[PDB]
Amino acid sequence: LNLDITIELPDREVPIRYRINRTVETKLNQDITVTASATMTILTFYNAQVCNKFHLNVSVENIHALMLKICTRYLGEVDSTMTIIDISMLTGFLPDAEDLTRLSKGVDRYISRYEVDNNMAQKVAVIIYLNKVSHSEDECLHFKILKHFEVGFIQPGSVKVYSYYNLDEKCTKFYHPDKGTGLLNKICIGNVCRCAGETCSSLNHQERIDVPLQIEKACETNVDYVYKTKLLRIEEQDGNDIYVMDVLEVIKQGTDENPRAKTHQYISQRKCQEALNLKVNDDYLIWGSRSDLLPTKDKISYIITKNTWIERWPHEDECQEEEFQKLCDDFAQFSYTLTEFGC
Amino acid sequence: FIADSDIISRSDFPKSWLWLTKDLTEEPNSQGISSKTMSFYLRDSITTWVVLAVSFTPTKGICVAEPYEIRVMKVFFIDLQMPYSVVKNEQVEIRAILHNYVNEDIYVRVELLYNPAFCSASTKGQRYRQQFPIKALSSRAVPFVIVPLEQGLHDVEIKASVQEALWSDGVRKKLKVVPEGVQKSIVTIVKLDPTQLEVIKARTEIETKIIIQGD
Amino acid sequence: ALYTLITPAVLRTDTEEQILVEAHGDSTPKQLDIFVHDFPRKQKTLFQTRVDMNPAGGMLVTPTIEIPAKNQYVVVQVTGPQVRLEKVVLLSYQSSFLFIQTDKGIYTPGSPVLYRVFSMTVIVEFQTPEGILVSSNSVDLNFFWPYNLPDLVSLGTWRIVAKYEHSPENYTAYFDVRKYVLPSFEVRLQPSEKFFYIDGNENFHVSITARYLYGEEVEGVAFVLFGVKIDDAKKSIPDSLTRIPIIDGDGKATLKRDTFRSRFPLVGHTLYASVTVMTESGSDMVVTEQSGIHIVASPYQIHFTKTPKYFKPGMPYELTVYVTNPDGSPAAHVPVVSEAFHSMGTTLSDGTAKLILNIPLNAQSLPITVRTNHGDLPRERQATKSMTAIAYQTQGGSGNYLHVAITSTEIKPGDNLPVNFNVKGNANSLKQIKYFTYLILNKGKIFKVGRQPRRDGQNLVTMNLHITPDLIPSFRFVAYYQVGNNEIVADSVWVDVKDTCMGTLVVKGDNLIQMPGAAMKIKLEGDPGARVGLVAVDKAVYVLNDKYKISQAKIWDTIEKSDFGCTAGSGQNNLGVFEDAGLALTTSTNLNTKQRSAAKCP
Numbered sequence A: 001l002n003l004d005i006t007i008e009l010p011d012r013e014v015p016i017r018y019r020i021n022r023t024v025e026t027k028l029n030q031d032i033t034v035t036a037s038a039t040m041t042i043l044t045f046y047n048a049q050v051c052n053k054f055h056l057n058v059s060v061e062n063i064h065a066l067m068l069k070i071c072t073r074y075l076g077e078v079d080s081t082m083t084i085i086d087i088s089m090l091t092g093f094l095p096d097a098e099d100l101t102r103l104s105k106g107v108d109r110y111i112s113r114y115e116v117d118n119n120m121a122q123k124v125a126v127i128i129y130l131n132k133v134s135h136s137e138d139e140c141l142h143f144k145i146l147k148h149f150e151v152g153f154i155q156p157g158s159v160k161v162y163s164y165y166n167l168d169e170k171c172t173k174f175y176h177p178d179k180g181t182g183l184l185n186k187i188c189i190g191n192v193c194r195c196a197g198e199t200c201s202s203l204n205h206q207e208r209i210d211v212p213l214q215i216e217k218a219c220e221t222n223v224d225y226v227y228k229t230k231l232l233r234i235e236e237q238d239g240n241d242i243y244v245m246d247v248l249e250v251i252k253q254g255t256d257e258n259p260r261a262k263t264h265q266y267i268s269q270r271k272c273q274e275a276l277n278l279k280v281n282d283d284y285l286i287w288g289s290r291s292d293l294l295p296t297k298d299k300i301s302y303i304i305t306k307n308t309w310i311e312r313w314p315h316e317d318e319c320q321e322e323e324f325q326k327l328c329d330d331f332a333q334f335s336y337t338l339t340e341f342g343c
Numbered sequence B: 001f002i003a004d005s006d007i008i009s010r011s012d013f014p015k016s017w018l019w020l021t022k023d024l025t026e027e028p029n030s031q032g033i034s035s036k037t038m039s040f041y042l043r044d045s046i047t048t049w050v051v052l053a054v055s056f057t058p059t060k061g062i063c064v065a066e067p068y069e070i071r072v073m074k075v076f077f078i079d080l081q082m083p084y085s086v087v088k089n090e091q092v093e094i095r096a097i098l099h100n101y102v103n104e105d106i107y108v109r110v111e112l113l114y115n116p117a118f119c120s121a122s123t124k125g126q127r128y129r130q131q132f133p134i135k136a137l138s139s140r141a142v143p144f145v146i147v148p149l150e151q152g153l154h155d156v157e158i159k160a161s162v163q164e165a166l167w168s169d170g171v172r173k174k175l176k177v178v179p180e181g182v183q184k185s186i187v188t189i190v191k192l193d194p195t196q197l198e199v200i201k202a203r204t205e206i207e208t209k210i211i212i213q214g215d
Numbered sequence C: 001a002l003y004t005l006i007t008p009a010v011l012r013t014d015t016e017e018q019i020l021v022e023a024h025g026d027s028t029p030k031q032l033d034i035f036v037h038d039f040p041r042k043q044k045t046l047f048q049t050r051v052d053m054n055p056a057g058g059m060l061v062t063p064t065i066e067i068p069a070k071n072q073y074v075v076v077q078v079t080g081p082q083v084r085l086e087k088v089v090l091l092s093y094q095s096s097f098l099f100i101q102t103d104k105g106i107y108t109p110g111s112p113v114l115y116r117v118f119s120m121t122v123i124v125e126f127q128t129p130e131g132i133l134v135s136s137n138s139v140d141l142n143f144f145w146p147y148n149l150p151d152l153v154s155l156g157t158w159r160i161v162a163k164y165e166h167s168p169e170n171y172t173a174y175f176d177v178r179k180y181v182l183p184s185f186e187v188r189l190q191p192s193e194k195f196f197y198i199d200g201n202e203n204f205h206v207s208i209t210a211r212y213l214y215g216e217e218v219e220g221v222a223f224v225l226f227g228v229k230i231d232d233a234k235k236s237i238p239d240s241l242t243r244i245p246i247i248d249g250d251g252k253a254t255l256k257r258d259t260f261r262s263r264f265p266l267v268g269h270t271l272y273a274s275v276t277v278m279t280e281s282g283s284d285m286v287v288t289e290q291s292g293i294h295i296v297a298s299p300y301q302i303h304f305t306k307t308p309k310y311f312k313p314g315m316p317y318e319l320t321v322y323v324t325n326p327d328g329s330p331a332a333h334v335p336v337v338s339e340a341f342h343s344m345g346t347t348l349s350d351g352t353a354k355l356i357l358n359i360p361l362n363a364q365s366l367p368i369t370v371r372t373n374h375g376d377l378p379r380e381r382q383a384t385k386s387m388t389a390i391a392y393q394t395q396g397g398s399g400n401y402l403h404v405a406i407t408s409t410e411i412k413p414g415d416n417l418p419v420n421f422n423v424k425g426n427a428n429s430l431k432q433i434k435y436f437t438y439l440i441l442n443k444g445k446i447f448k449v450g451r452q453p454r455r456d457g458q459n460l461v462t463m464n465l466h467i468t469p470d471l472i473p474s475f476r477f478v479a480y481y482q483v484g485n486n487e488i489v490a491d492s493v494w495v496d497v498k499d500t501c502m503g504t505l506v507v508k509g510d511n512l513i514q515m516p517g518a519a520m521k522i523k524l525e526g527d528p529g530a531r532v533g534l535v536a537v538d539k540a541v542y543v544l545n546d547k548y549k550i551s552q553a554k555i556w557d558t559i560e561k562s563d564f565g566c567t568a569g570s571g572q573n574n575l576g577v578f579e580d581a582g583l584a585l586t587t588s589t590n591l592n593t594k595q596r597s598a599a600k601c602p
């Protein structure tokens, strides 16, 4: 072989040469031009578009304390050997030791040593080892889960089922006393998601605005923008509800120091139609956080969360009635003094 | 409970370091042996370090010393075991485990720092914290449920201080988050070279490897 | 009267190679001109020099040659007044030995690979799992470049090669590329025995130790499955599978025999146990394997690898027996016997025992059988093997012999070793042996040469050899006398030397538990002027892989495996003694060693 090569890339502005008497990598999907004067291979990876091994059913029902109930079945042709049920406790929850100890002495079972305080197994992650899980009928176990400490927001727990000859394939379920599915609540459009909180944020009323106390609210850390908006139309994209709104006035401006030139989207789950009583062509007082922003199109879009304050702003038609009139002033003072002075 | 402003979370966990070379230009003793004292600081990892020294000497060839170990520990600390990678938008649970190595009974505050890249218990306002006890010479598992919302490396940070004492610990480890799909692999062609030329037209980020061989 | 030229059997480029030129029955000074050329073509002069030869130096000349790099043969020619010798000798391009240290044995995609190349112009190549080259180039031995692993890559065992420019043989090092996280604990395993009986009735046990990387015990459970590994393939025993608790980092897994019989109702294979440990919290697990438990009839194996396969009828034969465990590790304090010769010894630490065998004078052929005779073993569990040594053919049926004798055992540098020249033959020829010529060979080059006077009557001559670290890992001792300027009588012996470092390297420290960030101070004790290379690796990396790492024992192993001598000594005849010890010989009466087929031992 007495070669002399040269490769052309739309990528590189100058082509590459190498005397074959070898590799180069790009980040593009383009035509190549080769020149000789040997074999070549080209590779092009791209991203092209649950529980195959076990059936896993985990519920937590109420004891009229909670009863944790687990049901599983192997989907294989033959009973699985040496399967494992990996369990985590809800926050501030602990296993009833008496129950767990009954399960522990089961013919085909094992659980690690645990300490006990007042019938409470001192373990937040409990793992039960079974010799076999049936492939033909469901297998179930249950025990009581005891509330040790009270808490605001319980974190959901999880159950994993896997066997010796399939460790990498793990089937996971979450459980919460409130959210059946135990999944953290979130909103997605197309493919991008943001947190939602779970608690469904209701509309505000609001009879006499404490203008000093409201500036205080609209001035805390987490409040990045304060607009007056107009509900142009309500729609439903991927995420059940899209509230199309137009910024009438800008009272406080976010890091993106430039709104009003782009129509805003406010997004909430269909489970939240009731409490957010938004009507078309009604004016709204809106403020929130820029951590609630969800990127799309040319359009600017946020999702309705508890960091979002929503209050209906009457029209001028409205601003003559004995009920609405003292508030319209309240809204005028608020706007004025915030826009003129800042925090 | 000392402020989390005080505890600076450990984060420097190299899998290897001290890649240096070194001349024994010192003078030999009675024994004909030269000696070289050297200083360095340890990194953040709680583990044992093995230090291997291999030397070359013009008339004495090459020599591989016996390994020298360095145990690095704490009295109380966090151990965060992370998966290699996780898929965007999929809910997972990570288990930090707290170790109490003192022979007493302690009471502990564990807080998981918020991050905008995740969806978790921790919100911007307040970090999901919890208090509970640990028995003599024992340890306790702590689950955290997060949901990755961005691809890439994104820190997970956990901090814990004991009560009525000065023992604390913080860990910061980068979590790998990957595209929602399955990576698909096209060998665009296999051509040969019998001046000859050839155009190969166009066929989630993308890579393209270019292999030409001799035969 | 008789002229001789001795060179090593294979010749290396770019290194000082000593050679031997001798004049027997010639008391006259002369200068000798000596050349080396390419062969057959004789195009270019590769090396030259003139040397003085006199009765002052006992008519012996030991010059050195160097062949600059430029199957491939050369010719060493030597000429002067009365002298014209020429030997055709094989060439190797392996100037020295290269070893590759790497940073670690396992990498993640998109990380660097730090490496060093050590030598006892060089290029370094990196190869993929599929065996495709991706790097190659000259390496500055003072400065190496980290090699950057791509974010998308092929996973598995890569290899790195280091070599001289136009050489076919190399040193190869390995590393894995896996999508892995470091585990928080090591698992170490302890087998019940180093073997398993093919037809026994014992159970097999494995002790598991699991400890975190900083020191505490692990709590949790383990899953062990036993199997059999036939050459490449692994064949499991599905009813082995047991789950056992790991309490305070301790646990014992057991394979029942009736469970083994039930599945295997085997020769030349190994028992393996695959062990998977999980922390009690379920945070992480570890996978390791207990391997190399040969399925055997005897706990031992006998080897004749360290005995000469030739004897001298009428002289006492030195049988050096060697016993190992099945994995090939030396087995110490093992009694061995050969009934037929009523001989008996027990094995030293190196696994060897020397037995002297009295042999008849008219034997041409000598068959030997050795049995283990272990105090605690039933007869059918002893090990045996057989060999037959054949008699050294005297030159023209003369009945003239040479034997070199060593009684000293486990040889280490520092020692003074008696070396005996034992001569036997007809009274007429014996009265002519005026000196002996000896050659010390180490690492494939002729190291040293000297003379040993013999006075008349002296059929036993003892001299002293002082052993330095230059003789590591082993040397060959070869000697010959000549009768009346045309008969040559020769012998050789192979001597193992303890494999340490040639010099010294220690890393000294205080050994106290430390804190992330704490100031450390370490001490390096080594040889004056040494370049020392350091690295610190998280112990969690050894847990995952440790079979690729460099070590002193591997350095000495590879260096031995490339010895040009192929035999434990002596030979068919004069010619074979030299051939088997890795030497070339040509005399003025055309006593020529045959051509060396391959550089790697037959």
Ligand SMILES: [Ca+2]
Residues within 6 Å of the ligand: C473, C474, C496, C497, C498, C499
């Ligand atoms: Ca040796």
